[PDB]
Design a protein around this ligand. Structure first.
Ligand SMILES: Cn1c(=O)c2[nH]c(SCCN3CCOCC3)nc2n(C)c1=O
Length: 499
C-alpha cells in the first residue's frame, strides 16, 4: 500500500546543507570563467570578463556569430543585424529574416510549426505580445552578444576534463542566437566539422505539425520572456568528466548504500538538492531542438540553460558524462511526449551557493540503446552501464559525507529498451561504489517500487558487497541469457542463487 519504501527521504543528503565551502572561483587551465569573480555579488548582474570582445575562430572554441571571421566576402554578423532589426508583424517576416543569413537552407528548413504557433495556436493578444515585445527583446539580447560573451568559449571536447562557468545572462544571449539560428558551421547535414556535436540552432523546432511543437514553443517563450524582462543574476557551471580508473566490479568489497524508492514524485521536484540524473542521449539534450519530448528533453525545456550545453559539448564517449550546476527552472509542465503540456511559469526558489549558482546539480549520463532485449545482460554491456553511471556519480576530491544522494529512476528504459530491474541494480551498485545513497522514482509503477525495495533489503541484510552482486549478474547471463526472453527473470534468479 505504502507510497514509498526504504530509508526516509528526509534522511538523505541534499545540497547545500551537505556540501563543503566552495573554493574561491578562479579561472585555470581546467576552468574557463567568463565573468568578473572580483565583482560577483548576490542579486547583481555579473560583469563579463574581459571588458572588450576577444575572438577565437578555430577548432577548439565555439565559432561565434559575431566573429569578424564569420563571412559570406561579406560580414555575416552585419547581415544578421540588418535581417533581425526589422518589424515583425506576421510569422513570414520572421522566417524571411532568419533565412536572409541562411540562404543555403531556404528550401530545406520548414517553418510550419512556427507559422502555426503564431497564427493558429496563439490568440490575437498573445501573438501581438509575441511580435511587439518578446521577439524584439530576444533580438536585442541576441545582437548584444559581443558585449555579453566577450571571452572565447572552449569546446568541451572528447576526453577533456574541463569546466566552463558563465552567467545566466550570457546563456540567455547565446540561446537567443540559437533561436534565430545564427551559429555558423552548425547546420549542414553532411558536415565534418561539428559532426560529433549536437544541433544548437533551433530551426527544427519550427518544422512540422506535431501538437508537441506549440508546447515546446510555449515552454521556451516563457523562458525568453522572463530573462529578457529581468536579467537573471546567477552563474551556471558545465563540467565534462572523463574517467579512466574504473572499479574492478567483481572484486569490489564495498557495501551497498541506502535506498529510498517511491512510485510518486519526480527527480526535479522531489530530488531538490540531490544529484539529479538526466536520462541522456550521447548527444546531450537529445531531440530537444527537434522532435523529442521524454525525460531529457522535458528537463532541457523547463531548465533551458541546459540547452546551451549543446553549443560546446561533444558527443559523450562511454567513459564520460556532463555535470551541470546552477540551471534554473522557468516552467512547470504536465505529461510527456504526446501528452506534454506547458502549465505555467515557475519561480525557482532554490538557494544559490557561494558562486551564485542555483543549488541544482544535473548529470547527463547516456544509457545504451538495445536492439535486442537480451543484449543488455552481456557482461561487457553491463560493465559499460556500471562505468557510465559510476562516472556520473563519482566526485573525485570530495568526501562521501559531503555527497548528496542520487535522484534517479528507470534510466535507459522505454525507447532504449533497458530492463528497469537490471538498470535499477546497476545504478545501485554504481552509487555504492561512488559512496552515494540512492533516491529512486519509479514514475507510477508501484510493483517496480516494491521489487527494487525487496531486492535491496534482501541484499543488504545478507551483507552482499558490490562484487558479490556483480558476480550474480554474471551468473545470470551465463545461466539464462548466453545460450538462450529468458526462462527465469533476474530478481527471481538472484533470490534463488543466494538462498
Ligand atoms: C523518474 N522520472 C522518470 O522516469 C520520467 N520519465 C519521464 S518522460 C519518459 C517516460 N519515462 C517513463 C518511466 O521510465 C523512464 C521513461 N519524465 C520523468 N521524470 C520527470 C522522472 O522524474
Amino acid at each position: 500500500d505504502k507510497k514509498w519504501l526504504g530509508t526516509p527521504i528526509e534522511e538523505m543528503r541534499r545540497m547545500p546543507r551537505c556540501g563543503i565551502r566552495l573554493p574561491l572561483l578562479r579561472p585555470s587551465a581546467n576552468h574557463t570563467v567568463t565573468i568578473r569573480v572580483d565583482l560577483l555579488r548576490a542579486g547583481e548582474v555579473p560583469k563579463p570578463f574581459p571588458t572588450h570582445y576577444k575572438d577565437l575562430w578555430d577548432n577548439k572554441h565555439v565559432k561565434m556569430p559575431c566573429s569578424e571571421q564569420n563571412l559570406y566576402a561579406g560580414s555575416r554578423w552585419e547581415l544578421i543585424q540588418t535581417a533581425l532589426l526589422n518589424k515583425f508583424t506576421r510569422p513570414q517576416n520572421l522566417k524571411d529574416a532568419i533565412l536572409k543569413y541562411n540562404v543555403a537552407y531556404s528550401k530545406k528548413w520548414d517553418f510550419t510549426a512556427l507559422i502555426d504557433f503564431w497564427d493558429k495556436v496563439l490568440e490575437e493578444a498573445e501573438a501581438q505580445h509575441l511580435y511587439q515585445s518578446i521577439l524584439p527583446d530576444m533580438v536585442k539580447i541576441a545582437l548584444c552578444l559581443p558585449n555579453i560573451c566577450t571571452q572565447p568559449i572552449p569546446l568541451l571536447k572528447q576526453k577533456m576534463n574541463h569546466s566552463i562557468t558563465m552567467s545566466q545572462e550570457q546563456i540567455a544571449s547565446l540561446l537567443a542566437n540559437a533561436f534565430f539560428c545564427t551559429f555558423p558551421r552548425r547546420n549542414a547535414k553532411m558536415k565534418s566539422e561539428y559532426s560529433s556535436y549536437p544541433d544548437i540552432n533551433f530551426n527544427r523546432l519550427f518544422e512540422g505539425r506535431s501538437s508537441r511543437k506549440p508546447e515546446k514553443l510555449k515552454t521556451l517563450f516563457c523562458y525568453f520572456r522572463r530573462v529578457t524582462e529581468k536579467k537573471p543574476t546567477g552563474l551556471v557551471t558545465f563540467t565534462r568528466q572523463s574517467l579512466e580508473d574504473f572499479p574492478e566490479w567483481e572484486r569490489c568489497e564495498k557495501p551497498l548504500t541506502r535506498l529510498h524508492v517511491t512510485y510518486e514524485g519526480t527527480i526535479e521536484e522531489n530530488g531538490q538538492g540531490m544529484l539529479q540524473v538526466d536520462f541522456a542521449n550521447r548527444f546531450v539534450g537529445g531531440g530537444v531542438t527537434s522532435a523529442g519530448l521524454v525525460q531529457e528533453e522535458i528537463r532541457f525545456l523547463i531548465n533551458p540553460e541546459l540547452i546551451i550545453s549543446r553549443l560546446f559539448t561533444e558527443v559523450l564517449d562511454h567513459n564520460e558524462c556532463l555535470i551541470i550546476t546552477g540551471t534554473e527552472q522557468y516552467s512547470e509542465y504536465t505529461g510527456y511526449a504526446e501528452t506534454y503540456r506547458w502549465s505555467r511559469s515557475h519561480e525557482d526558489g532554490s538557494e544559490r551557493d557561494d558562486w551564485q549558482r542555483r543549488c541544482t546539480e544535473i548529470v547527463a549520463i547516456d544509457a545504451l540503446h538495445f536492439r535486442r532485449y537480451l543484449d543488455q545482460f552481456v557482461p561487457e554491456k553491463m560493465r559499460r552501464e556500471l562505468n557510465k553511471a559510476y562516472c556520473g556519480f563519482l566526485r573525485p576530491g570530495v568526501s562521501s559525507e559531503n555527497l548528496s544522494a542520487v535522484a534517479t529512476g528507470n534510466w535507459g528504459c522505454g525507447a532504449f529498451g533497458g530492463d528497469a530491474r537490471l538498470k535499477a541494480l546497476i545504478q545501485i551498485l554504481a552509487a555504492a561504489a561512488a559512496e552515494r545513497d540512492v533516491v529512486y522514482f519509479t514514475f507510477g509503477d508501484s510493483e517496480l517500487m516494491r521489487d527494487i525495495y525487496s531486492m535491496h533489503i534482501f541484499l543488504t541484510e545478507r551483507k552482499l558487497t558490490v562484487g558479490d552482486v556483480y558476480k550474480l549478474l554474471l551468473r545470470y547471463y551465463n545461466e539464462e541469457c548466453r545460450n538462450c526472453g529468458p526462462d527465469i527473470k533476474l530478481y527471481p534468479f538472484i533470490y534463488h542463487a543466494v538462498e
